[PDB]
Enzyme design. Structure first.
Site, PDB file in Angstrom:
ATOM      1  CG  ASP A 105      45.987   1.161  15.035  1.00 12.01           C
ATOM      2  OD1 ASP A 105      47.182   0.819  14.836  1.00 12.01           O
ATOM      3  OD2 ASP A 105      45.111   1.141  14.143  1.00 12.01           O
ATOM      4  CE  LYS A 110      46.962   2.674  11.806  1.00 14.34           C
ATOM      5  NZ  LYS A 110      46.892   1.449  10.938  1.00 14.34           N
ATOM      6  CG  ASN A 125      43.957   5.473  13.252  1.00 13.47           C
ATOM      7  OD1 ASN A 125      43.245   5.423  12.258  1.00 13.47           O
ATOM      8  ND2 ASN A 125      44.489   4.383  13.814  1.00 13.47           N
ATOM      9  CG  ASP A 134      40.977   2.721  13.988  1.00 13.39           C
ATOM     10  OD1 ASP A 134      40.256   1.939  14.642  1.00 13.39           O
ATOM     11  OD2 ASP A 134      41.886   2.335  13.219  1.00 13.39           O
ATOM     12  CB  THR A 156      48.204 -16.953  51.058  1.00 11.08           C
ATOM     13  OG1 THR A 156      47.714 -16.228  52.200  1.00 11.08           O
ATOM     14  CG2 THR A 156      49.673 -17.379  51.313  1.00 11.08           C
TER      15      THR A 156
HETATM   16  C1  NXP Z   1      35.925   4.896  14.057  1.00 12.00           C
HETATM   17  C2  NXP Z   1      36.746   4.679  12.801  1.00 12.00           C
HETATM   18  N1  NXP Z   1      37.195   3.439  12.590  1.00 12.00           N
HETATM   19  N2  NXP Z   1      36.938   2.490  13.382  1.00 12.00           N
HETATM   20  C3  NXP Z   1      37.408   1.282  13.071  1.00 12.00           C
HETATM   21  N3  NXP Z   1      38.095   1.139  11.959  1.00 12.00           N
HETATM   22  N4  NXP Z   1      37.221   0.219  13.841  1.00 12.00           N
HETATM   23  C4  NXP Z   1      37.045   5.772  11.794  1.00 12.00           C
HETATM   24  C5  NXP Z   1      38.084   5.645  10.872  1.00 12.00           C
HETATM   25  C6  NXP Z   1      38.325   6.668   9.952  1.00 12.00           C
HETATM   26  C7  NXP Z   1      37.532   7.820   9.893  1.00 12.00           C
HETATM   27  N5  NXP Z   1      37.897   8.755   8.878  1.00 12.00           N
HETATM   28  C8  NXP Z   1      37.510   9.958   8.470  1.00 12.00           C
HETATM   29  O1  NXP Z   1      36.615  10.616   9.001  1.00 12.00           O
HETATM   30  C9  NXP Z   1      38.370  10.349   7.288  1.00 12.00           C
HETATM   31  C10 NXP Z   1      39.503   9.684   6.828  1.00 12.00           C
HETATM   32  N6  NXP Z   1      39.975  10.360   5.749  1.00 12.00           N
HETATM   33  C11 NXP Z   1      39.189  11.429   5.494  1.00 12.00           C
HETATM   34  C12 NXP Z   1      39.274  12.402   4.497  1.00 12.00           C
HETATM   35  C13 NXP Z   1      38.323  13.415   4.463  1.00 12.00           C
HETATM   36  C14 NXP Z   1      37.303  13.435   5.412  1.00 12.00           C
HETATM   37  C15 NXP Z   1      37.216  12.453   6.414  1.00 12.00           C
HETATM   38  C16 NXP Z   1      38.166  11.447   6.450  1.00 12.00           C
HETATM   39  C17 NXP Z   1      36.487   7.942  10.816  1.00 12.00           C
HETATM   40  C18 NXP Z   1      36.244   6.923  11.726  1.00 12.00           C
END
Ligand code: NXP
Ligand code: NXP
Lengths: 281, 281
Positions: free
Chosen positions: B120, B122, B125, B141, B158
């Site tokens: 994923d 993108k 992420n 993520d 086999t």
């Molecule tokens: C591990 C995870 N997701 N797992 C999952 N969905 N299964 C995950 C997704 C987004 C963040 N975002 C962040 O830290 C931030 C996203 N936008 C921001 C803006 C300012 C500061 C931090 C972030 C951190 C961790």
């Protein structure tokens, strides 16, 4: 080494039935024979699969011990492996192949309805209930089996970032179960003719090339005595395109299996094996 | 509802950073900022994956609470998502794309060496360490990620009973990791040009047909200011044949990334972020 204490508590161990290893044992409480499969060290999940499946042509588990090795206790199939009936070019009467094959289809149909693919269907993994020729068969050995979603989740978003090979695989996904129908085709071929369709005996074509082209070894003289309907079913199971290959439903509807005599014989063997409690009307 | 007691014990919760939801919090013991990802009810195994991975361009987990919802505590990336830098046709200087892309490749190379496919990748992420343009990025993520054997076991016997589609798939197996290199290609395309290569804007060709043919939308005027080396790398990542597509190693060896200035800037940002104990010689 010795047998684990918890096993010995409940069972008296006896002779080897086959080799992995299968042993004759006696349940102490009932003084009845059982079979005990020893798998040396997803046996865990083979157990869970078998606990939840309930079909008269699928082996049932009576008990399980996880010790130095794994011990799986099963009902005893006195007739042994179907393998022994087809080695050395021995051949089953066509009528017996149908009785047995009908049972295999019913078994595999049940698996597929319940989201299970076996993946190792072969004569070694079909057990016979007795030394009589007309008997019940049970499919065993769910060690390679798979429980039928990652593609589906990927397709709920927009594929802006999605690789082309994932999109191309949508065409073919959801047909993994067809590997079982191919194996059944190969088993039926062997049963009807006493020899394997793909093999390195004689021929210069590699085994792989024989299988991917679907060009099975047809020896007319061996088959002359086999009916045309029988061979027709074999041909519809040994189709190389998994999407076009016959499914178990289509095989059960094929003319060769519209045989009310065979079906009667199966129903008769079923009720003969069953010990039911009283019924209201 | 309220936050779970075990979380509140250790952290003071504050404002929303993004939406799933990400919150600002303060670790009580250190009075330092952290980010807390709330995933509402393999989050279990996303945790295990992230616990074991140790790379400066991969997000590290500080803590985890499994309550009404899941709470994942991470280091705070003050710069936010890379997404916000590329919406509305905003475009990064080419030099900044390279700095960021180098880091993404290093990250994804590390995953692939360690048997992990992300699946994923993108802009959403990729997280930025600061509001400065030159910064560290971290990939986040791992909810769709996969740990890289069933085919291999099938091929030790086999294939007498083996279906032809299994043998045909031997040709392509072991290239699942290439989906990540495609995504990286798409991300680099977006970063360099400020628009997506495959899209339903204008055109009558379906998104699916654009992707499987690999015919990305090329608008010369947007690209004139982008170097040829840059676009060359994009072209080698957006190859439709997964076996021919550039791997992360090949991308890191590409002329566009042989830029000792960019590498120096990366090394400088690394040591700036690190708090090491004394060293013997
Ligand atoms: C591990 C995870 N997701 N797992 C999952 N969905 N299964 C995950 C997704 C987004 C963040 N975002 C962040 O830290 C931030 C996203 N936008 C921001 C803006 C300012 C500061 C931090 C972030 C951190 C961790
Ligand atoms: C579940 C299973 N294997 N699972 C796995 N390998 N992962 C299994 C394999 C073989 C038998 N065999 C039998 O009951 C017999 C085989 N030959 C015989 C001859 C006489 C009586 C019984 C058997 C029973 C169970």
């Amino acid at each position: 080494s010795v047998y684990p204490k918890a096993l010995r508590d409940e069972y008296i161990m006896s002779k080897t039935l086959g080799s992995g290893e299968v042993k004759l044992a006696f349940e102490r409480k009932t003084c009845k024979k059982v079979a005990i499969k020893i798998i040396s060290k997803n046996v865990e999940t083979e157990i869970e699969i078998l606990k939840k499946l309930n079909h008269p042509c699928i082996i049932k588990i009576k008990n399980f011990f996880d010790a130095e090795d794994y011990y799986i206790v099963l009902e005893l199939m006195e007739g042994g492996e179907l393998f022994d009936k087809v080695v050395g070019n021995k051949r089953l009467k066509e009528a017996t192949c149908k009785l047995y094959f009908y049972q295999m289809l019913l078994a595999v149909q049940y698996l597929h309805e319940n989201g299970i693919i076996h993946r190792d269907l072969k004569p070694e993994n079909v057990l016979l209930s007795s030394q009589e020729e007309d008997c019940l068969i049970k499919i065993t050995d769910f060690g390679h089996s798979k429980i039928l979603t990652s593609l589906m989740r990927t397709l709920c978003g927009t594929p802006t970032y999605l690789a082309p090979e994932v999109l191309v695989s949508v065409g073919t996904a959801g047909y993994n179960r067809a590997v079982d129908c191919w194996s059944l085709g190969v088993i039926l071929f062997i049963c009807l003719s006493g020899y394997p369709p793909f093999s390195e005996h004689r021929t210069q074509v590699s085994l792989k090339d024989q299988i991917t082209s679907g060009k099975y070894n047809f020896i007319p003289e061996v088959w002359a005595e086999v009916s045309e309907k029988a061979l027709d079913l074999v041909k519809k199971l040994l189709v190389v395109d998994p999407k076009a290959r016959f499914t178990t439903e289509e095989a059960l509807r094929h003319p060769w299996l519209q045989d009310e005599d065979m079906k009667r014989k199966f129903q008769d063997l079923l009720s003969e094996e069953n010990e039911s409690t009283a019924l209201p009307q």
